[PDB]
Design an enzyme around this catalytic site. Structure first.
Site: not given
Ligand SMILES: Cc1cn([C@H]2C[C@H](O)[C@@H](COP(=O)(O)O)O2)c(=O)[nH]c1=O
Ligand SMILES: Cc1cn([C@H]2C[C@H](O)[C@@H](COP(=O)(O)O)O2)c(=O)[nH]c1=O
Lengths: 217, 217
Positions: B121, B12-13, B10, B183, B178
């Site tokens: 993603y 995060e971005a 996983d 995750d 998140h």
């Molecule tokens: C679920 C979600 C993820 N994201 C972006 C930020 C997270 O670091 C990235 C990875 O998603 P995740 O946190 O579900 O693993 O996607 C958003 O900008 N808005 C959202 O509602």
């Protein structure tokens, strides 16, 4: 202050120092000094077990040993040579040294390793493992500290096992005992009790890892 | 029975695909095929949350992005560019590629990355980040699979968010949502639900990561 990164470390191995043990598991948990400080001053009797800092680098690896684990070692660690081999685990080799070096390079310097009973077990054992390798030691330039010495100096300002210290502070048994990551996380929790005083002590007592004598060989 | 290692992944971005996001956190959890095969098949309604395998390689890293995280991404992830930087985090760079290469090298081949919503993603983003680097991609030669497509095949033999699936299966809320490692551990639990059937599907549907198009140029 000067140590920018504390790297909480634990090893699991085939047995005790007299058996000339080999590493079967290692875990590094790198925490910036600011992330430690930004844990609150533990309050309440007993205090709750703190969550780790959000910003953390973690490396946990299983390692196939060249010799079998002792009966008592496999019992507490839940690892065996045959199980490590059948799951395709590699030995403590040059690629692992590169992995360790690259992980350590991602951390702001200077770095200090923190291990429970590090001076008598973890550091000398790690030094022995690295000395077998053909690549330069990845832990050159890094410093190290024994958390038992740390806790003794902070406390005094009977059992000093990792479990006994944790239970004295938190009134709960530690989880995942005698696993590298489990023990590292347990150590982290203990070091979050008085992190400001801990870092002060670390800056005062950190010694080069190169001064650590190998356990054997 | 060909995939020897499953690597639960996983990221995060900084934001959503349209913002041309950058990676802020990554977690790899390497599990040998045998450790999944020998997980208990889930019985009961709901079944208990499966125990993670004892033998596991884990890599969790925080990464300073070039651009700021969106307010919404910061709120859900608990990460910000500001905090990543003050705590000495480094960019997605050549040294990180070397670190990833050495980690992957310790795993028996063939390897398969497993990520929730990976096809849309995690995989394209990781491909974009690696394409920025001067040194060849360490993920050339590794396979990949989206666990959404996996669970869509397993369940059917309306939400498919990671949290929704976890709560549907285990009647429990996921912990540490998140966060890359949080995750990954949630994804592991869901994949341990029917682990033999998951492995068979992965074997049949895994594709070379080198066939993954980058999210953006
Ligand atoms: C679920 C979600 C993820 N994201 C972006 C930020 C997270 O670091 C990235 C990875 O998603 P995740 O946190 O579900 O693993 O996607 C958003 O900008 N808005 C959202 O509602
Ligand atoms: C505490 C203890 C450790 N050991 C060995 C095996 C462990 O993998 C290694 C590291 O100890 P640890 O599990 O406290 O980290 O030392 C024993 O053989 N017997 C023991 O009672």
């Amino acid at each position: 202050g000067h140590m920018q990164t504390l790297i909480f470390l634990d090893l699991e191995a085939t047995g005790l120092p007299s058996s000339r043990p080999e590493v079967t598991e290692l875990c590094l948990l790198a925490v910036h000094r600011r992330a430690l400080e930004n844990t609150s001053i533990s309050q309440g009797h007993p205090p709750p077990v703190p969550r780790p800092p959000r910003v953390v680098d973690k490396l946990s690896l299983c390692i196939a040993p060249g010799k079998a684990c002792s009966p008592g070692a496999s019992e507490i660690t839940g690892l065996s040579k045959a199980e490590l081999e059948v799951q395709g685990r590699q030995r403590f080799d040059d690629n692992l040294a590169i992995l360790l070096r690259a992980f350590l390079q991602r951390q702001p310097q200077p770095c200090c390793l923190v291990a429970h009973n590090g001076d008598r077990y973890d550091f000398p054992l790690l030094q022995t493992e690295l000395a077998r390798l053909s690549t330069p030691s990845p832990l050159d330039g890094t410093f190290c500290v024994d958390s038992i010495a740390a806790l003794k100096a902070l406390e005094q300002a009977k059992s000093y096992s990792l479990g006994s210290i944790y239970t004295r502070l938190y009134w709960q048994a530690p989880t995942d005992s005698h696993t590298a990551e489990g023990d590292v996380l347990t150590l982290l929790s203990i070091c979050q009790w008085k992190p400001q005083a801990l870092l002060q002590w670390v800056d005062e007592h950190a010694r080069p890892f190169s001064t650590v004598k190998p356990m054997y060989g």
